[PDB]
Symmetry: C3
Subunit: 153 residues, 3 copies
C-alpha cells in the first residue's frame, strides 16, 4: 500500500528480585510475573504497532537479545523498510499511576526518533492515569498503547 495504520498494546506487571540462601548457596528469588524483557511497555507497544501496520504480526517474531527493547524496535523497523515503508508518524500513550515523566518524555522521543530513523517531530509520547482505578490505578503494573502510520519511502 501507500499508507498503513498499526496498533499496539502492552502491559508490564511489577515484579521483584531478592537474594536467598538455600542449601548454603546464594540463589536469586523472583517475586511477581516472570519478565522475558526489560518491561519497556512504550517500546513494546510501539513495536507491535509498526509490525502490525506492515502485516508482520507482532513483537513475538523478531528473533526465532530480548532483554533490550530498542534492539527489538530497530529489528522491527529494519523489516518494515524491507517491505518498502518508512515512518509517517507515531503516537504513544503510556498508562501509569505516576506523575513526573515529562522531563523524560523528550529523551524517549529522541531515542525512538533515532531507532526509527525519523525526525523527533514525527514522534509523540504522552502519559495519562486511570485515576487510581484498575490494575494500573492500584499500581500493580503499567500499560501502554500506540498507533503508527507507515508510508512508502
Amino acid at each position: 500500500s501507500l499508507i498503513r495504520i498499526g496498533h499496539g498494546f502492552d502491559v508490564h506487571a511489577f515484579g521483584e528480585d531478592r537474594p536467598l540462601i538455600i542449601g548454603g548457596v546464594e540463589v536469586p528469588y523472583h517475586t511477581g510475573f516472570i519478565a522475558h524483557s526489560d518491561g519497556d511497555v512504550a517500546l513494546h507497544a510501539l513495536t507491535d504497532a509498526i509490525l502490525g501496520a506492515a502485516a508482520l504480526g507482532d513483537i513475538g517474531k523478531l528473533f526465532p537479545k530480548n532483554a533490550d527493547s530498542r534492539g527489538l524496535l530497530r529489528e522491527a523497523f529494519r523489516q518494515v523498510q524491507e517491505k518498502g515503508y518508512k515512518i509517517g508518524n507515531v503516537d504513544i500513550t503510556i498508562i501509569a499511576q505516576a506523575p513526573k515523566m515529562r522531563p523524560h518524555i523528550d529523551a524517549m522521543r529522541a531515542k525512538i526518533a533515532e531507532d526509527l530513523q525519523c525526525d523527533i517531530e514525527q514522534v509523540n509520547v504522552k502519559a495519562t492515569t486511570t485515576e487510581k482505578l484498575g490494575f494500573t490505578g492500584r499500581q500493580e503494573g503499567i500499560a501502554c498503547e500506540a498507533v503508527a502510520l507507515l508510508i512508502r519511502q
Copy 2:
C-alpha cells in the same frame, strides 16, 4: 475525504450453563453475563473500527445476529455503499491465553474473505496483561482494532 481511520474495542465475559431440575422439569441455568453473540471479540472490535471510520456509528446500529461474520460483512457492505474499500486493518486480541498463533492466519484469511481484500491487508496479534486485570484473572477477553479505509 478519501482516507478514513477508525477504532474498536470489545469485551466478552465468560459465562457458563448448567442443567437444573426444578418442579420435575429440567431447566437451563446461565451463570455470568448473558451473551447475545458468539462472543467473537476480534470481529466485533473490527466491525466497530470499520463502521467507526465511516462515521456509521457502531455494531449497535446494524440490525434494529449472533454470528459475528455476518455483522462484519454487513458493516463492510455499508462502508462500500459510501464508496470505501479496505486500506488495511490491525487487530490486537488481549487475553491471558497461550497459543493462538496457530490459528492467526486462519483468522486473517476469513477476515480477508469478508472484507473482500488481500490477506496481506489484514494483521492479527494477541498479547497478554501478565495476569493483571479482568483478562489477567481470566474473567473474559478483550480486543482492540484499528482500521484505515481508502476511497474507492
Copy 3:
C-alpha cells in the same frame, strides 16, 4: 507530513460530595478521586489524540479554563491548526457500564463538529461496555478511547 495519526485515552473516577458541620461551620466534604475537570472523558481523549497526532504532547500542556473541556478542545484544534492541520476524521469509543447514551450521541457529534470546525460526517462517536468486568464494569468510573486523523490544510 501530509497525514497524521493520533491516539487518546482518558478515565474519570467517580466522586461524590457531602456537606458537613465542623466547628459549627458548614464545609463540603469530597469522597473519592478529586476532580480537576468536568470529567468529560470523550473530549479529553479526543483532545489527546488531536494533539498527539501533531506531536504537541498532550492536554496537560494547553493552559499553564480546565473546568470546560470544549475550551480545551477548541484550544487544541487552534494549535494543530497553527501547524497547518485540519481534521480528516475522528472516531471515539466511550467505555461505560451504561445503556441509554445513544439518544445523546448525535448531540455530542454536533458539538465536536463545531469545535473542530468540520462536518459532523467527519466525527464518529460510539459506546460499548466491558460486560460488567473491570473498573468500568464495576461502575467505579468510565473511560474513553480516541483516534484522530489529521490532514494538511
